[PDB]
Write an enzyme that holds these catalytic residues in place. Sequence first.
Site, PDB file in Angstrom:
ATOM      1  N   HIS A 156       0.808  -1.224   0.000  1.00  0.00           N
ATOM      2  CA  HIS A 156       0.000   0.000   0.000  1.00  0.00           C
ATOM      3  C   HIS A 156       0.848   1.286   0.000  1.00  0.00           C
ATOM      4  CE1 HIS A 156       0.291   0.984   4.266  1.00  0.00           C
ATOM      5  NE2 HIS A 156      -0.112  -0.238   4.607  1.00  0.00           N
ATOM      6  N   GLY A 187       2.325   5.829  10.319  1.00  0.00           N
ATOM      7  CA  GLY A 187       3.688   5.588   9.864  1.00  0.00           C
ATOM      8  C   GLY A 187       4.347   4.364  10.480  1.00  0.00           C
ATOM      9  N   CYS A 222       3.329   1.317   9.677  1.00  0.00           N
ATOM     10  CA  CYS A 222       3.262   0.292   8.622  1.00  0.00           C
ATOM     11  C   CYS A 222       4.664  -0.181   8.219  1.00  0.00           C
ATOM     12  CB  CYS A 222       2.472   0.784   7.404  1.00  0.00           C
ATOM     13  SG  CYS A 222       0.931   1.662   7.797  1.00  0.00           S
TER      14      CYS A 222
HETATM   15  C1  QCO Z   1      -5.545   0.162   3.568  1.00  0.00           C
HETATM   16  C2  QCO Z   1      -4.399   0.900   2.926  1.00  0.00           C
HETATM   17  C3  QCO Z   1      -4.581   1.082   1.438  1.00  0.00           C
HETATM   18  O1  QCO Z   1      -4.380   2.253   3.462  1.00  0.00           O
HETATM   19  C4  QCO Z   1      -3.689   2.528   4.624  1.00  0.00           C
HETATM   20  C5  QCO Z   1      -3.715   3.885   4.914  1.00  0.00           C
HETATM   21  C6  QCO Z   1      -3.146   4.351   6.085  1.00  0.00           C
HETATM   22  C7  QCO Z   1      -2.527   3.465   6.964  1.00  0.00           C
HETATM   23  N1  QCO Z   1      -1.994   3.944   8.204  1.00  0.00           N
HETATM   24  C8  QCO Z   1      -0.827   4.627   8.303  1.00  0.00           C
HETATM   25  O2  QCO Z   1      -0.558   5.280   9.293  1.00  0.00           O
HETATM   26  C9  QCO Z   1       0.160   4.692   7.177  1.00  0.00           C
HETATM   27  C10 QCO Z   1       0.055   4.356   5.858  1.00  0.00           C
HETATM   28  N2  QCO Z   1       1.237   4.709   5.274  1.00  0.00           N
HETATM   29  C11 QCO Z   1       2.011   5.236   6.229  1.00  0.00           C
HETATM   30  N3  QCO Z   1       1.408   5.248   7.407  1.00  0.00           N
HETATM   31  C12 QCO Z   1      -2.881   3.855   9.393  1.00  0.00           C
HETATM   32  C13 QCO Z   1      -4.229   3.149   9.163  1.00  0.00           C
HETATM   33  O3  QCO Z   1      -4.323   1.928   9.227  1.00  0.00           O
HETATM   34  N4  QCO Z   1      -5.264   3.951   8.920  1.00  0.00           N
HETATM   35  C14 QCO Z   1      -6.606   3.429   8.697  1.00  0.00           C
HETATM   36  C15 QCO Z   1      -6.807   2.973   7.257  1.00  0.00           C
HETATM   37  C16 QCO Z   1      -8.199   2.442   7.009  1.00  0.00           C
HETATM   38  C17 QCO Z   1      -9.274   3.305   6.830  1.00  0.00           C
HETATM   39  C18 QCO Z   1     -10.563   2.817   6.673  1.00  0.00           C
HETATM   40  C19 QCO Z   1     -10.801   1.451   6.694  1.00  0.00           C
HETATM   41  C20 QCO Z   1      -9.725   0.619   6.854  1.00  0.00           C
HETATM   42  F1  QCO Z   1      -9.938  -0.724   6.848  1.00  0.00           F
HETATM   43  C21 QCO Z   1      -8.437   1.071   7.013  1.00  0.00           C
HETATM   44  C22 QCO Z   1      -2.228   3.413  10.694  1.00  0.00           C
HETATM   45  C23 QCO Z   1      -2.567   4.018  11.894  1.00  0.00           C
HETATM   46  C24 QCO Z   1      -2.188   3.446  13.096  1.00  0.00           C
HETATM   47  C25 QCO Z   1      -1.451   2.281  13.058  1.00  0.00           C
HETATM   48  N5  QCO Z   1      -1.068   1.691  11.921  1.00  0.00           N
HETATM   49  C26 QCO Z   1      -1.452   2.264  10.772  1.00  0.00           C
HETATM   50  C27 QCO Z   1      -2.471   2.108   6.648  1.00  0.00           C
HETATM   51  C28 QCO Z   1      -3.055   1.639   5.483  1.00  0.00           C
END
Ligand code: QCO
Lengths: 305, 300
Positions: free
Chosen positions: B41, B143, B145
């Site tokens: 991702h 961040g 990930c």
């Molecule tokens: C699914 C893919 C395409 O998109 C993502 C987008 C963002 C992330 N996240 C990041 O922080 C990140 C990505 N790149 C750098 N950092 C955070 C996250 O997970 N947010 C929520 C994303 C979601 C939003 C609705 C529904 C869902 F099922 C998921 C995060 C927060 C806390 C702990 N770990 C991670 C991970 C995957």
Amino acid sequence: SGFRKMAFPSGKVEGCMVQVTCGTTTLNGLWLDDVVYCPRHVICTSEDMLNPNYEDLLIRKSNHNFLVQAGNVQLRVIGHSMQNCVLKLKVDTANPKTPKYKFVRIQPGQTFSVLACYNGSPSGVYQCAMRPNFTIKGSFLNGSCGSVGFNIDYDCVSFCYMHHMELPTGVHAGTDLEGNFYGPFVDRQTAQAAGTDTTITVNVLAWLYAAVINGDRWFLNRFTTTLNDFNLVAMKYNYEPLTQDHVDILGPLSAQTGIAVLDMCASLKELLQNGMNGRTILGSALLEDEFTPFDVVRQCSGVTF
Amino acid sequence: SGFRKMAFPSGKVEGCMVQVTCGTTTLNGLWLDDVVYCPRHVICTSEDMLNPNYEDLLIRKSNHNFLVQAGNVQLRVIGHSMQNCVLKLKVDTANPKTPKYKFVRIQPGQTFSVLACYNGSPSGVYQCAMRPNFTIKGSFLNGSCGSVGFNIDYDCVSFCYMHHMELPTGVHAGTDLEGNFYGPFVDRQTAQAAGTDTTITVNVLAWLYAAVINGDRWFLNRFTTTLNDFNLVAMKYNYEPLTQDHVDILGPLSAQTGIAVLDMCASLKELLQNGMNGRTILGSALLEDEFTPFDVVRQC
Ligand SMILES: CC(C)Oc1ccc(N(C(=O)c2c[nH]cn2)[C@@H](C(=O)NCCc2cccc(F)c2)c2cccnc2)cc1
Ligand SMILES: [Cl-]
Ligand SMILES: [Cl-]
């Protein structure tokens, strides 16, 4: 999201662990620059640990009596001296993996990471706190002596604990890296008991702030308390007194969550008198006191090392 | 003596953490030999996320679109391929700090250490378990990930988890190091919910054995149970079924303490019924389930 008992990354400390053998006794040493630090009881025998004269036991030892092993390499001991309850073995080679470090003596309530070691080999890392009774509730087996407690502030490892012994209740006693024991303990096989422990109040409050930052608010209430009335309640439940210094330290967490420190004290006061009532806070049914206000900020802001 | 939630020393994994940047997105990568592994991702745009076509997004990328940073050194990306939900960036330098390692896919109930990282920099290490619903109850911020879960049994690091995302309930989802997600999760921001979580029964029993090894016997009782009657009572408290496999795995702890598995199962049934009554077991007022039978034996 999430809140876990989190230790500092142990890599900088792992590159310092060595095995120290003196006769039949094997424990761990901390190799920093050209010195290996280890508990001075490494020179004790069975009759000696009972009532040892370390100055007399040490004077009989030569440099070659100390086998120091860094991985599969035998380090050459070229000198030996004692500073309080720590033995300092001067070696011919400066540790190329020596990080930026300091020796710091910590106060009760402060937390640190422990890199548990056996035969100079790191086996695990855990986070713990220096209890108000100066013991640590660690996880240690035979041969763990010499394992160290540390913190990392920026690029610098502050060494604060060296493991020496286990008290009869299963709790552990140790010294700072200058060989001064934390607590009223001595390095000898004799009757020694940990004093009645107390809960680290500022740390419980810091953990309640961490629970609020993580969406747990059930314990909050409209009430506040004076610092004096809180200490009267806290003294009743074997809690450490909360000082104005502690209140000031909780300032940033109070500002971030919008819950004044005395406002969180009224929550803690209600939790002490009434209990949790089948509920949990951050997956715990007890009031957790091994996260300092700085640990909460570090984990809820992601500071890196 | 003593029993703590213990993580493996993270040094071997620290020397593998790198920062991976693709456009405005930055996350962590795991540099092993001449390959950097990170969540695929990383190539998603803000306009994507909901229904990304990773094969199409990746085909548009060149090697120089991926900035890989190991400390203060920019690593040169010389190739890129996708294996399931992990992106593999071939680099022009083999990591000199590459430990002896393996990629292992773990089962629910298994524990591992997580080295939480931000901008390719390790910030903390904690222990956790793969929950029965295939999520992990981690501590991860934006961040994180690319942060990995691992075990270090006998100098070899077995990598079992790579963090990908946080589900709406605050729990985390990720993959093994071959990019196959644990659980029915996908790397898209679509509506995804963790299934109801349950307690890892074999781990609770293993922790009760750890308490007995540490001198705590207050919870024991004169009773035993059949495996079937235990599971009937256990499912009512949202406990995972205890299988014959789990009973066999508890064999060494049963032999060491002299308490048969089905005898310990009756203490657990009683504990479930009565609660702790103001008492604690190994400094906990809850039944701890993130210690496997193997963890108990290693620590004791
Ligand atoms: C699914 C893919 C395409 O998109 C993502 C987008 C963002 C992330 N996240 C990041 O922080 C990140 C990505 N790149 C750098 N950092 C955070 C996250 O997970 N947010 C929520 C994303 C979601 C939003 C609705 C529904 C869902 F099922 C998921 C995060 C927060 C806390 C702990 N770990 C991670 C991970 C995957
Ligand atoms: Cl992008
Ligand atoms: Cl009940």
